[PDB]
Amino acid sequence: IFDCSHTMAAQILKQAMAMGMMTEYYHFIFTTLDLYALDLEPYRYSGV
Amino acid sequence: IFDCSHTMAAQILKQAMAMGMMTEYYHFIFTTLDLYALDLEPYRYSGV
Known part of the structure; x- marks a missing residue:
């Protein structure tokens, strides 16, 4: 579990x-x- | 193990x-x- 800004994210x-x-x-x-x-698609297909 | 050229790689x-x-x-x-x-440093930064 995490804590950051979407700029920093x-x-x-x-x-x-x-x-x-x-x-x-x-x-x-x-x-x-x-x-x-921002982008989600390279972050999309890993299964997590 | 992988049969590939650097193109397809x-x-x-x-x-x-x-x-x-x-x-x-x-x-x-x-x-x-x-x-x-073909030099891929962000690829080699997972310690694989």
């Missing part, structure tokens, strides 16, 4: 994606509601 | 990373020789 979303931490066991809970200001 | 290196599989659980070995010609 897609940064560290990229950092989560670059580390190969995209296994389905990894569960993710965030704060920001702005789930549309 | 980064295509499926993208699509395999798009599956959320970028893990040193796995091992990867490739037929092609052009790896200095």
